[PDB]
Amino acid sequence: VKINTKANDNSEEMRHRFRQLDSKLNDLKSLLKEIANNIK
Amino acid sequence: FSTHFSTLVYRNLQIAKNSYNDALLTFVWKLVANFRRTRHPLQALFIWAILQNKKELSKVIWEQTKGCTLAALGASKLLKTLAKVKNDINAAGESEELANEYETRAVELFTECYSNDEDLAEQLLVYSCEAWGGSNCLELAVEATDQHFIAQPGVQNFLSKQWYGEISRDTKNWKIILCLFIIPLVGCGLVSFRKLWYYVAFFTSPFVVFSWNVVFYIAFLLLFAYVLLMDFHSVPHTPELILYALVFVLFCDEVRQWYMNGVNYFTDLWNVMDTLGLFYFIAGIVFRLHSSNKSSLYSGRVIFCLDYIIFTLRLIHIFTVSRNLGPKIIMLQRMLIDVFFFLFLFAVWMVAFGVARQGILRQNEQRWRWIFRSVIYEPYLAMFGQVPSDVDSTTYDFSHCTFSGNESKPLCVELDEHNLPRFPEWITIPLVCIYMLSTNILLVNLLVAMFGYTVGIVQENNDQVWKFQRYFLVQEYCNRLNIPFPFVVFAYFYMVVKKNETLAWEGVMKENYLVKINTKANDNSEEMRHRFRQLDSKLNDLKSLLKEIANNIK
Amino acid sequence: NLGPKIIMLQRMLIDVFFFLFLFAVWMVAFGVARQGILRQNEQRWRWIFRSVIYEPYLAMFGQVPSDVDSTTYDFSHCTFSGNESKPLCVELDEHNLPRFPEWITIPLVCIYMLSTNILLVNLLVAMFGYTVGIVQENNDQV
Numbered sequence: 001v002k003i004n005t006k007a008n009d010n011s012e013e014m015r016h017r018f019r020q021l022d023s024k025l026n027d028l029k030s031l032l033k034e035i036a037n038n039i040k
Numbered sequence: 041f042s043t044h045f046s047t048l049v050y051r052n053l054q055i056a057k058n059s060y061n062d063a064l065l066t067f068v069w070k071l072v073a074n075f076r077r078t079r080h081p082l083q084a085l086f087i088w089a090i091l092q093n094k095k096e097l098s099k100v101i102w103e104q105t106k107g108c109t110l111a112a113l114g115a116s117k118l119l120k121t122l123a124k125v126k127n128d129i130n131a132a133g134e135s136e137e138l139a140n141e142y143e144t145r146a147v148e149l150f151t152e153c154y155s156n157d158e159d160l161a162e163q164l165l166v167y168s169c170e171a172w173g174g175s176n177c178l179e180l181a182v183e184a185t186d187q188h189f190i191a192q193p194g195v196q197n198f199l200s201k202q203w204y205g206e207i208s209r210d211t212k213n214w215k216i217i218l219c220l221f222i223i224p225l226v227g228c229g230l231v232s233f234r235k236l237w238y239y240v241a242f243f244t245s246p247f248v249v250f251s252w253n254v255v256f257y258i259a260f261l262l263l264f265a266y267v268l269l270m271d272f273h274s275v276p277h278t279p280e281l282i283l284y285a286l287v288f289v290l291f292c293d294e295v296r297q298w299y300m301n302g303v304n305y306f307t308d309l310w311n312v313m314d315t316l317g318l319f320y321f322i323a324g325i326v327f328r329l330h331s332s333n334k335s336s337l338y339s340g341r342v343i344f345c346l347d348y349i350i351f352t353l354r355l356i357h358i359f360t361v362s363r364n365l366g367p368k369i370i371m372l373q374r375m376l377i378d379v380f381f382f383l384f385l386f387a388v389w390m391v392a393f394g395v396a397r398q399g400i401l402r403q404n405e406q407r408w409r410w411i412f413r414s415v416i417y418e419p420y421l422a423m424f425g426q427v428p429s430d431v432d433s434t435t436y437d438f439s440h441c442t443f444s445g446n447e448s449k450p451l452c453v454e455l456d457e458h459n460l461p462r463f464p465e466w467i468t469i470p471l472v473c474i475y476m477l478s479t480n481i482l483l484v485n486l487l488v489a490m491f492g493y494t495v496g497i498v499q500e501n502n503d504q505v506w507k508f509q510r511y512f513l514v515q516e517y518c519n520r521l522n523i524p525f526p527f528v529v530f531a532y533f534y535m536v537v538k539k540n541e542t543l544a545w546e547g548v549m550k551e552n553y554l555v556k557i558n559t560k561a562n563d564n565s566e567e568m569r570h571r572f573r574q575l576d577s578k579l580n581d582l583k584s585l586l587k588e589i590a591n592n593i594k
Numbered sequence: 595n596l597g598p599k600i601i602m603l604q605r606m607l608i609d610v611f612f613f614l615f616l617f618a619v620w621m622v623a624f625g626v627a628r629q630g631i632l633r634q635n636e637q638r639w640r641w642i643f644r645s646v647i648y649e650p651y652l653a654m655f656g657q658v659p660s661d662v663d664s665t666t667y668d669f670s671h672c673t674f675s676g677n678e679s680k681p682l683c684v685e686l687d688e689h690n691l692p693r694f695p696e697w698i699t700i701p702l703v704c705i706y707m708l709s710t711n712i713l714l715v716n717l718l719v720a721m722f723g724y725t726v727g728i729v730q731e732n733n734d735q736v
């Protein structure tokens with residue numbers, strides 16, 4: 001477990017979090033587009 | 041080649057070829073002259089681009105040539121020789137850097153090749169050149185003193201396999217050395233032949249020939265010493281005739297070396313030493329044959345003694361391949377400057393002290409031998425811990441000195457009106473004390489410190505130089521008849537009386553090496569910014585589409 | 595306290611062997627040359643080795659071989675024949691004067707002393723210093 005923690009201490013998860021946020025934003029944009037299409 | 045070839049570069053190349061010349065310079069010069077006035081067009085283009093200092097274009101052209109290691113080695117040699125003639129300071133760095141870069145490229149490519157298949161790598165190494173420069177990779181690296189390429193594990197392993205010959209490289213040295221003495225032990229399984237026929241295989245190995253030559257040289261030295269010390273008479277006896285016979289074959293080998301090579305053969309120090317030793321031996325024989333006159337015999341004996349010193353000092357050179365003493369012997373020649381500095385300081389102090397003491401003790405010696413004896417020899421002996429003496433009146437005695445120069449004794453000290461010595465001790469004694477302090481202690485300790493620093497500094501690359509010299513010696517031994525020294529005269533007399541899969545594999549490994557370099561460069565892992573920019577552009581496009589949809593709705 | 599140093603002691607054989615090799619080469623050369631140019635046909639092995647090896651060996655410790663200069667040479671210690679247990683007398687010429695020239699013997703001994711007593715010992719000191727510096731890293735482990 002200590003070896004695994006030392007390996008994971010890279011702290012590169014920021015890129016993964018940013019990618020997840022971008023995917024969520026894309027999903028929100030798609031939902032907004034669908035709502036706009038439904039309105040018209 | 042006719043028009044786009046730079047005129048300045050053309051003139052410089054012409055001057056270098058006409059002035060220095062070399063096995064490769066002549067070839068490139070002739071090719072350039074022919075084109076201006078196997079065809080190998082890629083090699084010609086590579087040379088044209090490299091002679092004009094086009095690093096990137098030269099690298100691009102290099103990736104297309106079939107023989108890449110040989111081309112890189114030739115390029116490094118060409119750049120080094122061109123820089124050796126250049127006078128501009130700025131270009132001297134650029135040419136050296138480019139040559140080093142190409143040498144590194146060749147080293148890396150050969151390391152990649154050897155790690156895949158040793159046999160094919162060795163075949164490529166021995167692969168003869170198709171008139172690229174008239175030589176293969178090893179010869180070009182040697183002529184370009186590319187020590188890195190010769191010091192890498194693959195070339196050293198190849199040289200070791202060639203050196204041990206048929207005998208397996210994984211054979212204990214002591215076992216083979218023991219088997220050398222007792223012949224019948226070779227039949228037994230003590231010695232391997234992994235690589236009757238066994239005898240020929242054992243005796244054709246240059247290792248065994250070298251060992252036998254060492255044994256015979258030691259025996260020759262023993263015989264020489266015995267003749268000098270115990271069996272020297274007016275008329276030479278059988279042992280001295282045997283000694284002359286043994287020297288004759290060495291003289292014949294020296295003449296053969298003079299014939300194969302030329303005046304360049306005398307550039308090396310040890311060849312000069314050998315020639316001087318042989319000439320001294322001949323002069324000693326000439327003096328000795330005058331049995332009637334004893335003075336000639338004594339002169340011949342002295343000449344033989346000096347020649348014996350010369351012969352004996354060569355063991356240091358011959359034993360520079362043992363792999364334990366070799367590196368230290370190689371480093372030995374790296375400490376001349378410290379010795380010269382020490383000798384300079386010591387000589388200055390010696391002259392000053394000797395002249396002062398002789399002047400303040402004795403007047404008008406008029407004999408040169410005693411002048412130098414008192415001025416140089418006695419102060420020189422102080423280096424080893426003995427005081428010059430004669431500086432204090434108490435220990436001085438008049439029995440050893442002579443008032444006149446008729447006898448072979450030092451001149452007596454100047455005496456005053458009362459027949460007492462005239463020199464004052466209160467300046468002589470401090471003088472000798474200061475001289476001893478300066479010479480015996482400070483200088484020796486300073487020399488020790490300088491030797492320590494030099495040893496520390498030069499240990500980094502000593503093994504590389506030793507490996508280069510090992511290659512030289514191994515090639516020298518393999519090049520000659522490869523016969524034991526005492527039995528080479530027969531070979532001389534008889535010979536006088538009577539007398540591309542590899543390139544494709546190299547290209548594939550070159551492509552693999554280029555791909556590896558590209559991967560190493562791309563390992564930066566900076567693509568995250570590009571991915572983020574692409575995501576931002578996609579988001580902007582989605583926003584524009586949403587705005588268009590909203591506009592369409594209203 | 596002494597253990598690590600004793601352990602490191604066995605790490606300096608190669609330097610000693612190199613020093614002994616060079617010293618032996620020089621010793622043999624100088625001894626043979628001097629014996630040949632001073633005396634002829636000793637015929638006794640013990641004195642041969644005494645003059646060729648032992649006396650030059652003593653030069654390692656700072657004493658000059660001697661017998662190279664005619665001034666200090668005396669005939670009392672030497673014997674013309676080998677009956678006695680003394681070194682053989684130097685070869686004499688027609689006028690009963692020693693025959694060897696000093697202008698080659700003296701430089702020979704000076705060069706030998708310079709090469710052996712000073713250069714070799716200092717080189718050994720330097721090699722010992724380097725070896726001590728290098729091997730101190732893992733001596734405690736051994």
Ligand SMILES: CC(C)CCC[C@@H](C)[C@H]1CC[C@H]2[C@@H]3CC=C4C[C@@H](OC(=O)CCC(=O)O)CC[C@]4(C)[C@H]3CC[C@]12C
Pocket residue numbers: 217250251252254255258259361362363
């Ligand atoms: C005939 C009598 C008077 C001579 C006896 C003296 C021995 C001490 C000499 C004779 C031959 C010598 C050997 C001749 C050949 C070699 C091989 C040499 O080792 C290598 O060649 C290493 C090569 C490498 O791998 O680089 C070291 C010296 C050695 C053992 C010599 C060591 C000393 C020996 C045994």
Ligand SMILES: CC(C)CCC[C@@H](C)[C@H]1CC[C@H]2[C@@H]3CC=C4C[C@@H](OC(=O)CCC(=O)O)CC[C@]4(C)[C@H]3CC[C@]12C
Pocket residue numbers: 313353356357360369370372373701705
């Ligand atoms: C003016 C008078 C005093 C004449 C003096 C001449 C000597 C100083 C010459 C004669 C023989 C020479 C030597 C022959 C052999 C050697 C060993 C050699 O040692 C090495 O080079 C070690 C490195 C290697 O050879 O691989 C260096 C030159 C030296 C001392 C030579 C240079 C100096 C010597 C003693």
Ligand SMILES: CC(C)CCC[C@@H](C)[C@H]1CC[C@H]2[C@@H]3CC=C4C[C@@H](OC(=O)CCC(=O)O)CC[C@]4(C)[C@H]3CC[C@]12C
Pocket residue numbers: 258261262265266355359362363364365615618619622646
């Ligand atoms: C006494 C007089 C009348 C004759 C002169 C004798 C010398 C010419 C001989 C006697 C023994 C020989 C030595 C026997 C053993 C060795 C060790 C040898 O060094 C090695 O074995 C290195 C091997 C390695 O490094 O592994 C070099 C030669 C040497 C000094 C030999 C060189 C010449 C010596 C001193």
Ligand SMILES: CC(C)CCC[C@@H](C)[C@H]1CC[C@H]2[C@@H]3CC=C4C[C@@H](OC(=O)CCC(=O)O)CC[C@]4(C)[C@H]3CC[C@]12C
Pocket residue numbers: 464465466467469470473474477
């Ligand atoms: C650090 C180094 C360079 C200094 C050397 C220290 C001592 C070895 C020297 C310094 C001054 C010297 C002294 C200078 C003068 C004399 C008088 C001299 O006797 C005389 O006066 C000679 C005339 C006479 O009276 O007969 C005997 C030596 C002595 C004590 C010298 C002996 C050694 C001394 C103490």
Ligand SMILES: CC(C)CCC[C@@H](C)[C@H]1CC[C@H]2[C@@H]3CC=C4C[C@@H](OC(=O)CCC(=O)O)CC[C@]4(C)[C@H]3CC[C@]12C
Pocket residue numbers: 385474477478479482483
């Ligand atoms: C009455 C007193 C105050 C006079 C000064 C006493 C000391 C300061 C003197 C006496 C002897 C001198 C020394 C005599 C010889 C030398 C070697 C000399 O070395 C060199 O300059 C290069 C040559 C070499 O290294 O041997 C340096 C100074 C030193 C130590 C001298 C420096 C000053 C010393 C110690």
Ligand SMILES: CC(C)CCC[C@@H](C)[C@H]1CC[C@H]2[C@@H]3CC=C4C[C@@H](OC(=O)CCC(=O)O)CC[C@]4(C)[C@H]3CC[C@]12C
Pocket residue numbers: 595596
């Ligand atoms: C005089 C003749 C007739 C008899 C021979 C006497 C020696 C056998 C004895 C006398 C005193 C002894 C020594 C007394 C003290 C010491 C120090 C001792 O070293 C330590 O104490 C190391 C301890 C540490 O490292 O902390 C090793 C033995 C030694 C040299 C002893 C070893 C043997 C010696 C020299």
Ligand SMILES: CC(C)CCC[C@@H](C)[C@H]1CC[C@H]2[C@@H]3CC=C4C[C@@H](OC(=O)CCC(=O)O)CC[C@]4(C)[C@H]3CC[C@]12C
Pocket residue numbers: 600601603604
């Ligand atoms: C041919 C003639 C001249 C015979 C010469 C034999 C000697 C050279 C032998 C006899 C006793 C030996 C010694 C017995 C004890 C020691 C101490 C020993 O020192 C160490 O190993 C220190 C490291 C440790 O022991 O932990 C090394 C071997 C040595 C010198 C031995 C090797 C050499 C000696 C003096």
Ligand SMILES: CC(C)CCC[C@@H](C)[C@H]1CC[C@H]2[C@@H]3CC=C4C[C@@H](OC(=O)CCC(=O)O)CC[C@]4(C)[C@H]3CC[C@]12C
Pocket residue numbers: 383408409412413416417420695696697698700701704705708
């Ligand atoms: C740096 C080292 C290796 C060089 C040694 C320096 C001096 C110690 C040597 C160099 C040349 C030698 C000289 C060479 C020749 C002679 C003549 C010699 O006297 C003779 O001529 C003997 C015959 C006679 O006249 O009776 C006395 C020694 C001397 C001055 C030698 C004494 C010491 C000298 C100056």
Ligand SMILES: CC(C)CCC[C@@H](C)[C@H]1CC[C@H]2[C@@H]3CC=C4C[C@@H](OC(=O)CCC(=O)O)CC[C@]4(C)[C@H]3CC[C@]12C
Pocket residue numbers: 372379383616705708709710713714
């Ligand atoms: C008339 C003049 C111009 C002749 C040359 C004078 C000096 C350059 C000679 C005289 C004595 C020579 C020295 C005599 C002995 C040695 C030991 C020798 O050492 C070795 O090669 C290995 C053996 C060892 O280290 O002792 C190196 C050269 C050196 C300093 C010789 C180098 C050249 C020296 C200083």
Ligand SMILES: Cc1cccc(COc2ccccc2C(=O)N(CCCN)Cc2cccs2)c1
Pocket residue numbers: 253254257290293294297310311313314315317318350351354358524525528
């Ligand atoms: C003073 C003097 C003069 C000539 C020869 C020597 C002994 O030199 C060696 C001793 C042992 C092993 C090899 C050598 C050595 O290199 N040659 C080549 C010399 C190149 N000029 C001598 C050899 C003859 C046959 C095989 S080897 C010494």
